[PDB]
Ligand binder design. Sequence first.
Ligand SMILES: O=c1cc[nH]c(=O)[nH]1
Ligand code: SF4
Length: 210
Amino acid sequence: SHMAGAQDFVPHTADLAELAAAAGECRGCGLYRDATQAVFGAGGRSARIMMIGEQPGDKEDLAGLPFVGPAGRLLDRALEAADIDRDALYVTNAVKHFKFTRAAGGKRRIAKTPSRTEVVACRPWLIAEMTSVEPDVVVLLGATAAKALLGNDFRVTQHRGEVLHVDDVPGDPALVATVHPSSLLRGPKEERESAFAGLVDDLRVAADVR
Ligand SMILES: O=c1cc[nH]c(=O)[nH]1
Ligand code: SF4
């Protein structure tokens, strides 16, 4: 069967503060139990560009805000190269509770890919955030966020660098699917620098869309 997920837990408000506090009470999937807190979005409803990642990392889970670690610094590098003010954005994630595993002698917490069940469970919060902010443009950072709004069969590589519209997205924002900043953290340097430049292209396009 198709799950209710977080729908039981989303209060009937468009206020981003009330939603974030309510999200700390969510039991829409299993991820609230081990995590410290919900990591809701950052920014205000006046934003015209919304950005969506995959899930919190270790430091996100401690801070309670998205993109505060290494991936967030690289994101800030990309936004600066695209002439975008981070505080003019609404930045969030498809999944709001840190999914992780502990380990014998490892890093304290190691992030684990959310399952599609968890992504669909958490999606009502994303819908609430888009209803709250009414973005004109939505940047989808990486495969998980893209599939969160475009469906489980969406392939980012098939649509890189296109401005899309979908039928189920509230307010009918333009959509730009692109690379996740964490992807620029490892790999061959050449590929990483060209990918960073491509991210910058997708951001400049997004900041230009009307
Ligand atoms: O906030 C964050 C941090 C790491 N990876 C994501 O997708 N979002
Ligand atoms: S992850 Fe999303 S759905 Fe699962 S419990 Fe936390 S908020 Fe609710």
